[PDB]
RNA sequence: ACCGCUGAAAGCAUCUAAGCGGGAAGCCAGCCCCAAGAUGAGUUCUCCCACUGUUUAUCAGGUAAGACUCCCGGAAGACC
RNA sequence: GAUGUCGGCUCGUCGCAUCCUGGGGCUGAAGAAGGUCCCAAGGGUUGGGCUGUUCGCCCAUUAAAGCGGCACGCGAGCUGGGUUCAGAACGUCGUGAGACAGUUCGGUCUCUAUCCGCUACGGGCGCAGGAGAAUUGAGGGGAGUUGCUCCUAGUACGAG
RNA sequence: GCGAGAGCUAACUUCCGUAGCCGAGAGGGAAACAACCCAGACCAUCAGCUAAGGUCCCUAAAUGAUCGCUCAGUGGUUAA
């Protein structure tokens, strides 16, 4: 997982989506698996 | 926005009030919703109507309907997940409708079907949960597809039949 | 839950087997029942046992219509446990049987005024690179300006012991019905002639 | 030259917290008890009628009776003394929920905590009916 | 924290905005000890019971149940 | 018309930007062992040698051997090794008296606690009779650590 | 406060210019509080209108009216 204050895509997956107050970062691979929080 | 309704003849709503109530072949099931969410049936199919259009409102009301729609093949049809076991002495007996797990653990793993599920076993290497609501079959074959995920180097545990596990691949 | 009053009596040598154990002898003497409490009279469940006995001519007019009210006959000690019953008097035949765990609760011996150094440890200090403050005294209080006090519970001299006290899971390894006696493995608290009240495990293992 | 005292009354109201938003209530009850519409109308002594409330476990919160509202309670030197708790978490003694908001729209002084003794609280319904052989003119909130 | 079921707004997808579940030496309960001066001062069992004193001595005074005083001790304790 | 100074010792308690134990994501993660980011302060965090030390280096261990705060926490609590009295010495500066980035041996650290606070223990009164005794629990406190061996299993895994 | 030097366009920092206030200023406001805001106390009065500020309850006074904005407790401690 990956808490990052810029969270942005990182390739034609990356789905940035926002669950309780947060805003976050499923991609179809993990490494790009963000999370500002 | 979301509107055809197959109601197929099974079925018997009964939107009394905001307990969105019904009854078919499968067992009657109820399923609420929002009152201000407006529906019932019109001629013969139904429809699922909305007051306001754009989020607050168009949300629910994508919702309801996807929602009746499903206790419609709900009671009409019943719904069954199919899980398989894999690995080496991955196995599944039974014990009356008790799924019986058998998946590497020093001990052997007991599963419970709650109020309105039954397990089914074919060859202990496939599982199968099927059922009334479309819900707690899956959020029950969640519980066993949790019993062990698959891995990153074999994929093995419960999974999906057709599950798409590709290999991290090591040493 | 279940219980039954005794008296401490004494410890002592005793082999089961080749393994020498020593035991803390106790007497539970025959207990009476004197009051059933229920949740629908005194809003809870519970009883009332009695124990060393008592000449009617020390017993106070009230006390004998309490004791009186279930003809039982002075005792001078009395005590609840809670969720128990039985029909009769509480005695410690089938109650306790040898090899389970108990846990024994007298009244800690009374050790008077103590210091910190032997009511909370401490370590006092020096003895000869110089002093005033040899061995015991504590060192400090508190900080400074901050907290411009010391706080609630700071460990200082004190009346140590004469506690209420619970020893748990003891093995009781003999029991002489025919004589209220029990023995019990291991060291039960106060001293001999003092009341000690056995319990079923509060919750072992 | 302005008016005297009472006395030789004590109306004893009966408030419903039912549904009710706890403070909006709160307030009213802290209105009545303190002096309402008042008879003398009087600072020196309290003539503001009794009350009582029934239900209280079912009074009403908004976005936080999980997150938020957490009633906190520093007890003895605060060696870590940090106690607090949801109000949610306060399905053990809705009673206090109440009780315990008020008792801050009430004067603090002397005066003001022997008012908090005219506040009576009950967690039920017509159980709490029981606790009541006076008055009871039911002047619900608004 | 983290993983999820059913799932719209974005006819797909989504742990989510309706809803529902799993989940930490931590939190609350649980264990042992204190505790109604919890002056909102609680509960239960038992005992003694309704004395005397004329607007001149308006309230105290015999007493019940019970207890203190004091004596002799104590595994209680500085004194209490 | 005085807020005692470095370091120890004693006594603690608090924050978390967690040192170890707890849970988790990703790993270039096979397993075992690790890296790293998230959540998480219940509790725990060893004994020696050198130095006045703090620090740090080191011996032997450990799950670990956290970092900081509280007048660089704590002298009406102790020490007094350190350094900012009087003696004396060396080097150095000064014609000198004296001086010092310095170094070195020596050198009286004040029985009596009033208010708050704190630990124990009593007397009064109160709790709508006067008494004996048995309790409910509002609330509050204490405790809350970790290793190793065995078993499962020489399995899963792994060319081994 | 405004205009500058200094200083890290740091400090209840420092030095000038300039206006106001405290100093020599009570009263209302700003929870509390020199100088910020309103306003300058001759004494007496259970009389009245207003400023800055305010009008759920702790306090005096519309939980006021109408059209909107945010579900964060933003409101009730900063930024790329």
Same mark, same amino acid.
């Given at each position: 997982m990956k808490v990052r204050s810029s969270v942005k895509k990182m390739c034609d997956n990356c789905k940035v989506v926002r669950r309780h107050g947060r805003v976050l970062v499923i991609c179809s691979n993990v490494k790009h698996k963000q999370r500002q929080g | 926005g979301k509107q055809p309704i197959a109601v197929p003849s099974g079925v018997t709503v009964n939107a009394q009030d905001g307990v969105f109530k019904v009854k078919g072949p499968k067992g009657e099931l109820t399923v609420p919703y929002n009152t201000e969410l407006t529906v019932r049936q019109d001629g013969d199919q139904l429809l699922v109507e909305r007051p306001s259009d754009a989020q607050k409102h168009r949300?629910?009301?994508?919702?309801?309907?996807?929602?009746?729609?499903?206790?419609?093949?709900?009671?009409?049809?019943?719904?069954?997940?199919?899980?398989?076991?894999?690995?080496?002495?991955?196995?599944?007996?039974?014990?009356?409708?008790?799924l019986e797990m058998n998946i590497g653990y020093s001990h052997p793993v007991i599963i419970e079907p709650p109020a309105g599920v039954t397990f089914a076993v074919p060859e202990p290497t496939r599982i199968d949960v099927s059922g009334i609501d479309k819900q707690l079959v899956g959020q029950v074959a969640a519980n066993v597809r949790k019993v062990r995920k698959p891995d990153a180097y074999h994929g093995k545990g419960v999974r999906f039949v057709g599950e798409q596990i590709a290999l991290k691949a090591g040493k | 839950?279940?219980?039954?009053?005794?008296?401490?009596?004494?410890?002592?040598?005793?082999?089961?087997?080749?393994?020498?154990?020593? *035991?803390?002898?106790?007497?539970?003497?025959?207990?009476?029942? *004197?009051?059933?409490?229920?949740?629908?009279?005194?809003?809870?469940?519970?009883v009332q046992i009695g124990y060393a006995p008592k000449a009617e001519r020390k017993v106070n007019k009230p006390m004998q219509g309490h004791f009186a009210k279930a003809g039982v006959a002075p005792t001078r000690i009395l005590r609840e446990f809670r969720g128990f019953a039985p029909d009769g008097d509480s005695v410690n035949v089938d109650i306790f049987?040898?090899?389970?765990?108990?846990?024994?609760?007298?009244?800690?011996? $009374?050790?008077?005024?103590?210091? *910190?150094?032997?009511?909370?440890?401490?370590?006092?200090?020096?003895?000869?690179?110089?002093?005033?403050?040899?061995?015991?005294?504590? $060192?400090?209080? $508190?900080?400074?300006?901050?907290?411009?006090?010391?706080?609630?519970?700071?460990?200082?001299?004190?009346?140590? $012991?004469?506690?209420?006290?619970?020893?748990?899971?003891?093995?009781?390894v003999?029991?002489?019905?025919?004589?209220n006696l029990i023995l019990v493995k291991g060291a039960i608290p106060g001293a001999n002639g003092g009341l000690v009240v056995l319990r079923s495990a509060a919750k072992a293992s | 030259?302005?008016?005297?005292?009472?006395?030789?009354?004590?109306?004893?109201?009966?408030?419903?917290?039912?549904?009710?938003?706890?403070?909006?209530?709160?307030?009213?009850?802290?209105?009545?008890?303190?002096?309402?519409?008042?008879?003398?109308?009087?600072?020196?002594? /309290?003539?503001?009628?009794?009350?009582?409330? /029934?239900?209280?476990?079912?009074?009403?919160?908004?976005?936080?009776?999980?997150?938020?509202?957490?009633?906190?309670?520093?007890?003895?030197?605060?060696?870590?003394?940090?106690?607090?708790?949801?109000?949610?978490?306060?399905?053990?003694?809705?009673?206090?929920?109440?009780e315990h908001a008020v008792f801050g729209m009430l004067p603090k002084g002397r005066q003001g905590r022997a008012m908090h003794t005219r506040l009576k609280v009950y967690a039920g319904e017509t159980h709490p009916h029981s606790a009541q052989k006076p008055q009871v003119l039911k002047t619900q909130p608004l």
């Open positions: - | 949300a629910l009301h994508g919702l309801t309907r996807t929602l009746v729609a499903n206790a419609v093949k709900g009671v009409s049809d019943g719904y069954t997940i199919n899980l398989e076991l894999r690995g080496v002495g991955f196995r599944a007996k039974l014990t009356g409708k008790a | 839950m279940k219980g039954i009053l005794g008296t401490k009596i004494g410890m002592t040598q005793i082999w089961k087997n080749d393994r020498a154990i020593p *035991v803390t002898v106790v007497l539970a003497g025959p207990c009476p029942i *004197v009051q059933r409490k229920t949740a629908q009279t005194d809003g809870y469940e519970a049987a040898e090899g389970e765990k108990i846990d024994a609760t007298g009244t800690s011996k $009374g050790k008077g005024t103590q210091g *910190v150094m032997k009511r909370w440890n401490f370590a006092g200090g020096p003895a000869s690179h110089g002093s005033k403050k040899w061995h015991r005294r504590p $060192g400090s209080i $508190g900080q400074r300006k901050t907290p411009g006090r010391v706080y609630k519970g700071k460990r200082m001299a004190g009346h140590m $012991g004469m506690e209420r006290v619970t020893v748990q899971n003891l093995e009781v003999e029991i002489r019905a025919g004589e | 030259k302005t008016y005297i005292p009472k006395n030789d009354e004590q109306n004893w109201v009966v408030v419903d917290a039912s549904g009710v938003p706890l403070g909006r209530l709160a307030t009213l009850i802290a209105s009545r008890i303190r002096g309402k519409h008042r008879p003398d109308f009087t600072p020196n002594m /309290i003539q503001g009628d009794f009350v009582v409330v /029934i239900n209280a476990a079912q009074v009403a919160l908004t976005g936080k009776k999980l997150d938020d509202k957490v009633y906190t309670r520093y007890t003895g030197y605060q060696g870590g003394l940090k106690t607090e708790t949801a109000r949610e978490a306060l399905s053990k003694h809705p009673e206090r929920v109440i």
